[PDB]
Amino acid sequence: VKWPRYIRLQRQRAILYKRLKVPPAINQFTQVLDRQTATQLLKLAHKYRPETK
Amino acid sequence: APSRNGMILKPHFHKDWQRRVATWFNQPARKIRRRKARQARARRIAPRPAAGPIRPIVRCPTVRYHTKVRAGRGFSLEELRVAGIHKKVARTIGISVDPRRRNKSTESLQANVQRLKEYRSKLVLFPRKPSAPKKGDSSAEELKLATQLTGPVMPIRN
């Protein structure tokens, strides 16, 4: 499909992040927390939520 | 084509000067305009001094003029903190302040501090509320004697 220019842009930006030599300071946010640890942390964080208005 | 003897002259009229000429035929009209505005201001700030605030003893910068003492911008902050006048209350009670002035000397600062103490002796401050007088307000017998002074407040003579 000849996609629109924003769809094309937001896809090939991800292609450029896969191409370019990303510095470790920006690579480090791809090394991310896994599923069962993250759901454990968010179950714990649900206890200490700030108040709504 | 110069003649026999005289100066040689370079008059700066080679541009188009007639299209830009300021002529002063509104000189007396503008004097009357300044005068009427000055009188309206002087009766608007009605018992306050007509010349505005008080401005310090200050002597002129350069080698040509440092023997002469003139009026300055405002009383410096060190002058005010020595005279015990708060830097925000001075502009309320009529004392010109600038924070930019340094003080490299001592007796000039002492002349300005004496001038501030003499001004606070001389001023008559009316109450902020007319029916209820307060602490730092002058007494009602000199409230009836308070009036404007024309000319600068304590003129700086050499």
Binding site: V1, K2, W3, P4, I7 | -
Partner: protein, 118 residues
């Protein structure tokens, strides 16, 4: 769901109609071109009265924004007479001379001397 055509076109979105909080103009404007101010006066020339006595029509001067349907409806309301056809032209003065051919049950001469022109 799959995409057959390799051209992406803009998807059809929902669009609402106006629900304004206040009308722009408060009152609707009065029809300044009404059945009285559309016809101005009938012509009383010799060609006009020869045409009303021969062709069972009437000749009027109307303003230039009038339709033939508007002139027909105007003469029907103002004189209670039915109209066969209408022929309009713009004079070199700038007026619109209209020719109101009546229905054959009415006679233009008696219509004229009851509306005043004679």
């Amino acid at each position: 769901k799959i995409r057959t055509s390799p051209t992406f076109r803009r998807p059809k979105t929902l669009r609402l109609r106006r629900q304004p909080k206040y009308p722009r103009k408060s009152a609707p404007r009065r029809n300044k071109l009404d059945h009285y101010a559309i016809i101005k006066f009938p012509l009383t020339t010799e060609s006009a009265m020869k045409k009303i006595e021969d062709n069972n029509t009437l000749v009027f001067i109307v303003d230039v924004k009038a339709n033939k349907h508007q002139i027909k409806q105007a003469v029907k309301k103002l004189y209670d007479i039915d109209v066969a056809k209408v022929n309009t032209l713009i004079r070199p003065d700038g007026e619109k001379k209209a020719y109101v051919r009546l229905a054959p049950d009415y006679d233009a001469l008696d219509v004229a001397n009851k509306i005043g022109i004679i």
